RNA sequence: CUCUUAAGGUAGCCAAAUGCCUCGUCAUCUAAUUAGUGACGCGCAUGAAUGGAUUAACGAGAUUCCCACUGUCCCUAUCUA
RNA sequence: UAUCUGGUUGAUCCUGCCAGUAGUCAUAUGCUUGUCUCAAAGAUUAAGCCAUGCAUGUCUAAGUAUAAGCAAUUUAUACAGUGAAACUGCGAAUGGCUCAUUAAAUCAGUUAUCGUUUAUUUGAUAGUUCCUUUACUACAUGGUAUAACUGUGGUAAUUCUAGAGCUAAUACAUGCUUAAAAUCUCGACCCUUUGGAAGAGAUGUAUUUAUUAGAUAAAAAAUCAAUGUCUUCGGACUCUUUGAUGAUUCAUAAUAACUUUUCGAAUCGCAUGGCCUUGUGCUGGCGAUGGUUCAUUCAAAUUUCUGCCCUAUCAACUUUCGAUGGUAGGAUAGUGGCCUACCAUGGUUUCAACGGGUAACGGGGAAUAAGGGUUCGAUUCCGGAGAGGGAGCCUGAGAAACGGCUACCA
RNA sequence: GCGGUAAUUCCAGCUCCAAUAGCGUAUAUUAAAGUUGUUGCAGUUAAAAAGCUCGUAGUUGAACUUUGGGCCCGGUUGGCCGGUCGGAUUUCCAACGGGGCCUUUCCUUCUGGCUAACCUUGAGUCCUUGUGGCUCUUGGCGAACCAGGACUUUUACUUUGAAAAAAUUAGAGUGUUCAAAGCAGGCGUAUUGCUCGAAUAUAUUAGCAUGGAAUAAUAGAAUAGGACG
RNA sequence: ACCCACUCGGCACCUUACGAGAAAUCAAAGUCUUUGGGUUCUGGGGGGAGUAUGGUCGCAAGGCUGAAACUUAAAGGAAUUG
RNA sequence: GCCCGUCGCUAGUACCGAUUGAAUGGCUUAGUGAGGCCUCAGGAUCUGCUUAGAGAAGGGGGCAACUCCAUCUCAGAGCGGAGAAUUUGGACAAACUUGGUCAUUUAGAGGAACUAAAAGUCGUAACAAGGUUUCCGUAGGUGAACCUGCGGAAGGAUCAU
């Protein structure tokens, strides 16, 4: 094809962006970023489709170029910035602070935060080597790379970040027992407090979940993301806490509430 | 490239098409609520052998089975809401057994004939 | 195969920066370098003992296993240091809810390490494009010699 | 221009395989820089993503490592003398990698005997400790020490010159000394 | 049906080195063909060891076309003995 | 949503096809045609041919303004507003269209890169540049040579351009620079031991080659060649540091050198303030463009497993002029018979190779409703291929590009 | 099959039927078709068993190798009761499943890490005449999988699960005035917000992961060149 | 050698029909819509036509393999009455 | 009654067939070989570095001697760069000429089938013991159906000494 694509039809957007089909033809492609382009959320889709702050693409862009909303401290002028898992997205007009966290079938929440706790983000570490000039450095699901980390660190832990200087303040070890957001596969979005891990030497450890009523499912390791102890995470989670009723319990729920 | 917009057609036809029989019952019921088309009564067969073909399938499953339980007693209550199914036969081995006139009488030709104000199906 | 005088070729055989300093009197007269490949296959004794000097080898050179593990019955062994498998499986037509016998034959690169025979079940291991057809290597034998020191004389 | 693809090119069945796809730009070769011998001459060629590869055409001199002495030197590259792909490459003193190449020892010569103070073939105060500290460690070889006479050590092209430019490698020693050696007079 | 014979030309084959009419008619090859070839056959007067039909191979045998080739020609010129 | 009916007979039961019957995101055509919503549409045949117009351009406080441009107000006699032209930078490789080729190809699911390139976005990343190192190198900043423009011109003709004269940079081409410390090589000397020394050079990153470190399968010893720290001078060396992977010659580091030396800011915009020895000294705020390496993201290229319609009136096929493999090299961003040289004789097939056909782009899907199936998918999404037919190639991160060029054929 | 002089078929009038902003025709295809038959055809005579036998490829192929008995743990429906202000759990009862044991019984295997469970018991005991009951450390369970070493007869099938685009399909919620659709929307202080959504399923060959060990293959110890230490 | 009873394996015949078939009839042509022991082969309305074409075997005659266009509403089977 | 073939008319389809027949499409030998790229050369002009003179400027700082950095301007000489036309050898390789091959088509005198087809002309082959029982294989023969030899079958006109 010649060339990296530069547009993204409708239908073919990630479906979790929920875009209708109709009422154009194209969905914002998500610039190059700090996370993919499969699970992310480009801005103009949270200021115009989340928030209903503007109505047209037009106005997403008189919104921006105006360094009203910031993205984990930084202002991200960018129309289309793809902006994921973990972020924080901060309005100085109108007070408001915002965190990307899934919801329980698979999609990105309006999380309302503090002010203070939208000044660390979480971010799991995906790879740890030795840099050049022999310093050691981690990555993180978001681009981010800290040099000089704690050496315990190994992959596939969680890393608590400053947001406002670049550098870690405490991390949390991928063991039997923890807080996990699990972020892909059809249990995007539960949260369960690892069971056990298979091993599969060659490719794709399974990680056995457990959330808080007796639930049990599996996802491959790299769609587990920790995120604390059991009862104790490290972000405010959303409402539901990511169990996943089932539709009969769901309709029962939605139901339940029924007098005016 | 825009997404297709979707559609569907609402009626089926007759395989014999000249079943005497099927035809005089076709006008009685044309005749008493006061329609125009075999269509019109196409319309509403067609709807009620989808109902049916869902109660089949569900039927054939396991009672208390999730996906029964979910779909059949939605498949019931959507019935009942717009009056077509009893009260007291609202466990879908009746909607099985439903019949044409059973929607034909909700429309709102008949109840606006049934409730006076019309006193003719077709001043209705 | 390689077989006897591995110096047998027009360039000088050797393991790549293996280096042997000769003003250093040594009794192995060669340093020779090895790895163990991994998924629990033991690197043979053969490829450590032996002094040959194939550098598709698994165990002592610079080819890596990844990806598929399959594993096939010996068909041809009449190419120097490479063999065929015929890996067989029977393939499903719904239509009739029967299976049909099929097959695939897999050309495999084979270190000399292993001494192979036309019917041995051999376990290869996927690498990189190794030759034009070559995409798997020879990494565990399976049988020994199907029955053959069986099938001896009268008694 | 030369493609490097499988798509003409029988299958293993033998099959002939009809042309899809007109030839692309990233399957492309180039020809060979077949680089000899002296007047220094390097052309740039720009590959792919921008990338440069500095295509060597009359290089004269290389840097070759004493292996076993462990140091490096600049010498003249004399000519060609053996070579396993291809006969042609010694007739007309070619360049390429796995070249066997005779080269100046001069330099090699100098540091020796400046380095050990023995003067293959065949007085400052620190200089005699230096010396003396040193050998018992100058047995160096035989047939690698009766090369400096004619001024000439056998070595083995390392570099690859059509890709970088450079013509370096290693004098040649011990075992694989001992296989050129032999080639080289039995053919001779 | 009729005259009539010893019997009244069968299988084949053809304007054939056998056909008068004849430069037969049809087709083909050509710009154009008393030529060539394939067909047709009430065939002046084809025809069965007076041998009929077919036929690979062979021919200083008769004939037709094509390719190559050329002073055969257009249209002549020049050299040697 | 599991249905049949008409036609062989003088009549009869069969076999059996023909006919009827219903549907078609199935085309056409005829007749008829009022309202609402909805909205496919030169695919089929001719990837046949094309008039004309349009479909790719683009500027921020922030690369270049002496328009002999407009505007004048307004601190501005280097510039300062606005701004044609033009340079520079970037984009034109997306999009849109078509379905010609294509049958182990494409494509789908599933793999691989420990086998590679990647503009960009995002996150990191640079005290080393000079010279035998006091009469010294522009750093308070080095070089011309051009467009536009001015003027003189040519041609029937074009997004043709020639000669002459100017002038810019984040264009082009150059070229300075900064702490401490350590480790290494040399060694002037002095004095003989167990030896140790004044100070001379080397040491950014990148490139190329060679050597080495990168332990760990549980524990101990003698000796050789060297040579390390601490002396309670027989000697000891006690604590001695180790990353990732299933797996590497991985990451990373060290040694000797190598290079027509990669990079290490001669750039711009707003502010203009501290602080004395008052030098217009020395400092200093915010963010813009950049810049090498790594990472990230958008990608790409190859790639494992398995699955294609009809065909034997295709049975053997493949190595001419690579067919299958080995060694070496060359070429590529890189693997690989990708190419070359040398050597070997291999590779596929009735479990259908090879060849032929396709009125064949593959897939998500579409039509038909007991089920099992049958038939279809040029065409709204994904992937591929193409731009009259072939081939070649410039630019560039990315094209074998066609609204880019060159050649041949039409 | 009608029409050759009373035409139930043609050309019309009349009247009538069918579908109806639609209706006919042509071509294709699907259903009817068990007339392509795996489900599911037929072959004495209707179309169809090679003249006969051998026979390779292919398909297929007898029976038999841990059965039977004992104990324990805890699950999900359904009953007779309701304790409670439609739904709740104990004890009583069946019923159908899952796990683990001992019966001569590999569970691959050693070397520690860990222990969840008792042969434990150290005191007694909330309390119904006590094995109904668990907090509870000092001798005494391995497997429940970590990681390091050392090895492993092969498969088919079936279970569950991960990995998985949207539109399409099936399907939930929602009164586009209905409906095809759409993915909306619904509530208020309708004068400075409240708020439910944007489900679920199929996704089948292959590949991956896991439970099962019937059925059907494969390999083993016979010139012992066998098996444990 | 013959007789009687039995039992294997033969070539057949007799009566029944539970059963099967369109019937004629059939201990297989049965144990099939209550449709599955293994396996081989052929047929798919009638003509055209076992013709054309190619392949191959044969001395020949001919054998084996073997179409289509077009045409057509029947051809056919068993039985019943004439 | 049914019914067979030659022969005759009208229409249609397919076949054989001199023309070494014709056309389209895909491959391809051999020869010829454009262009761009790579490469050996080339030097229209246009400058770098180095070597020295003649005429001036700027000063590391002296009473005479001493002496550096930049820049401009002409006789003339040592060792490299750019780069046009042109040009060597290459790989890639369109395309032209002449052939071969594969696939899809295809005209043709004439020849000979079949159908429409029912009938016409000549006979009576078949169906009744069809008036010579029928049919199968093979061979020869005859206007035509057909006849006859040899060996079969009953689907016979006989389940029977
Ligand atoms: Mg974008
Ligand atoms: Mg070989
Ligand atoms: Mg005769
Ligand atoms: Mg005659
Ligand atoms: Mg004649
Ligand atoms: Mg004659
Ligand atoms: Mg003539
Ligand atoms: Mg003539
Ligand atoms: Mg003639
Ligand atoms: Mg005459
Ligand atoms: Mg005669
Ligand atoms: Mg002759
Ligand atoms: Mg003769
Ligand atoms: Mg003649
Ligand atoms: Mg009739
Ligand atoms: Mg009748
Ligand atoms: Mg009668
Ligand atoms: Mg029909
Ligand atoms: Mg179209
Ligand atoms: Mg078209
Ligand atoms: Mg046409
Ligand atoms: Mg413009
Ligand atoms: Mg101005
Ligand atoms: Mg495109
Ligand atoms: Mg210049
Ligand atoms: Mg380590
Ligand atoms: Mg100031
Ligand atoms: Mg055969
Ligand atoms: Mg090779
Ligand atoms: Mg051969
Ligand atoms: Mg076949
Ligand atoms: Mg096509
Ligand atoms: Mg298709
Ligand atoms: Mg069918
Ligand atoms: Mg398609
Ligand atoms: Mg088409
Ligand atoms: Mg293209
Ligand atoms: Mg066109
Ligand atoms: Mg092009
Ligand atoms: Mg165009
Ligand atoms: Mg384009
Ligand atoms: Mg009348
Ligand atoms: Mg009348
Ligand atoms: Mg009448
Ligand atoms: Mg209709
Ligand atoms: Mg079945
Ligand atoms: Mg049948
Ligand atoms: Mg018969
Ligand atoms: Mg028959
Ligand atoms: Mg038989
Ligand atoms: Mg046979
Ligand atoms: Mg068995
Ligand atoms: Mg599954
Ligand atoms: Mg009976
Ligand atoms: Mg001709
Ligand atoms: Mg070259
Ligand atoms: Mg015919
Ligand atoms: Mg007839
Ligand atoms: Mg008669
Ligand atoms: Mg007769
Ligand atoms: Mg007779």
């Known amino acids: 094809a010649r060339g990296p694509k530069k547009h993204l039809k409708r239908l073919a957007a990630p ?106 983000k979480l971010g799991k570490v995906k790879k740890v080597q030795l840099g050049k000039k022999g310093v050691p450095y981690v990555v993180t699901h978001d681009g981010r790379t800290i040099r000089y980390p704690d050496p315990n660190i190994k992959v596939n832990d969680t ?52 959330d808080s009523l007796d639930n049990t499912f599996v996802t491959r390791l790299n769609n587990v993301f920790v995120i604390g102890e059991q009862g104790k995470p490290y972000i405010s989670l959303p409402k539901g806490k990511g169990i996943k009723l089932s539709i009969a319990e769901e309709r029962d729920r939605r139901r339940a509430q029924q007098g005016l | ?118 006193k003719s199906v077709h001043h209705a | 195969s390689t077989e006897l005088t591995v110096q047998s070729e027009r360039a000088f055989q050797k393991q790549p920066h293996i280096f042997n300093n000769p003003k250093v009197k040594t009794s192995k007269r060669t340093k020779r370098w090895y790895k163990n490949a991994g998924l629990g296959f033991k690197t043979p004794k053969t490829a450590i003992e032996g002094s040959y000097i194939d550098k598709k080898c698994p165990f002592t050179g610079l080819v890596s296993i990844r990806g598929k593990i399959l594993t096939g019955t010996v068909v041809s ?29 897999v050309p495999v690169h084979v270190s000399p390490a292993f001494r192979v025979q036309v019917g041995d079940i051999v376990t290869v291991g996927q690498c990189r494009p190794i030759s034009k057809t070559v995409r798997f290597n020879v990494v565990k034998v399976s049988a020994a010699a199907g029955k053959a020191n069986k099938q001896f004389a009268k008694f | 221009g030369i493609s490097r693809d499988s798509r003409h090119k029988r ?11 007109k030839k692309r730009k990233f399957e492309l070769g180039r020809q060979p820089a077949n680089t000899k011998i002296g007047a220094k001459r390097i052309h740039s060629v720009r590959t792919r993503g921008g990338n440069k590869k500095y295509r060597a055409l009359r290089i004269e001199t290389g840097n070759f490592s004493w292996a ?116 080289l007079t039995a053919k001779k």
């Open chain 4, 11 to 21: 299958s293993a069945t033998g099959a002939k395989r009809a042309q899809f796809r």
């Open chain 2, 1 to 118: 490239p825009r997404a297709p917009r979707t559609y569907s057609k609402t009626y089926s036809t007759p395989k014999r098409p000249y079943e005497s029989s099927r035809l005089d019952a076709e006008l009685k019921l044309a005749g008493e609520f006061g329609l125009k088309n075999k269509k019109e009564i196409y319309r509403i067969s067609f709807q009620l052998s989808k109902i049916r073909r869902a109660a089949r399938d569900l039927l054939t499953r396991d009672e208390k089975d999730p996906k029964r339980l979910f779909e059949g007693n939605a498949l019931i209550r959507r019935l009942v809401r717009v009056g077509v199914l009893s009260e007291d036969k609202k466990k879908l081995d009746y909607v099985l057994a439903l019949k044409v006139e059973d929607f034909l009488e909700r429309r709102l030709q008949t109840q606006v004939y049934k409730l006076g104000l019309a």
């Open chain 3, 77 to 105: 062994t009449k190419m120097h240091r490479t063999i065929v498998i015929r890996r067989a499986y029977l393939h499903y037509i719904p239509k009739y809810n029967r299976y049909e016998k099929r097959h695939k034959n």
């Open chain 1, 159 to 210: 890393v608590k970040i400053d947001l406002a200087s670049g550098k870690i303040t405490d991390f949390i070890k991928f063991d039997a027992g923890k807080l996990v957001y699990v972020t892909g596969g059809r249990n995007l979005g539960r949260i369960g407090t690892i069971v056990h891990k298979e091993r599969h030497d060659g490719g794709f450890d399974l990680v056995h979940i457990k």
């Open chain 1, 15 to 120: 479906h979790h962006w929920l875009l209708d089909k109709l009422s154009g033809c194209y969905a914002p492609r998500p610039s190059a970023g700090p996370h993919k382009l499969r699970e992310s959320l480009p801005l103009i889709v949270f200021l115009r489709n989340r928030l209903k702050y503007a109505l047209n693409g037009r106005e997403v862009k008189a919104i921006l170029m105006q360094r009203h909303v910031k993205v984990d401290g930084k202002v991200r002028t960018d129309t289309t910035y793809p902006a994921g898992f973990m972020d924080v997205i901060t309005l100085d007009a109108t007070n408001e602070n915002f965190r990307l966290v899934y919801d329980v079938k698979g999609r990105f929440a309006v999380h309302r935060i503090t002010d203070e706790e939208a000044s660390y």
């Open chain 4, 68 to 183: 076993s002495e462990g140091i490096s030197k600049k010498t003249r590259i004399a000519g060609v003398v053996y070579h396993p792909s291809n006969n042609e490459l010694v007739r007309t003193n070619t360049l390429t990698k796995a070249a066997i190449v005779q080269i100046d020892a001069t330099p090699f010569r100098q540091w020796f005997e400046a380095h050990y103070g023995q003067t293959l073939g065949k007085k400052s105060k620190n200089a005699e400790r230096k010396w003396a500290a040193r050998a018992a460690s100058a047995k160096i070889e035989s047939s690698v020490e009766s090369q400096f006479s004619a001024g000439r050590l056998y070595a083995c092209i390392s570099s690859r010159p059509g890709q970088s430019g450079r013509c370096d490698g290693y004098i040649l020693e011990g075992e694989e000394l001992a296989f050129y050696l032999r080639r």
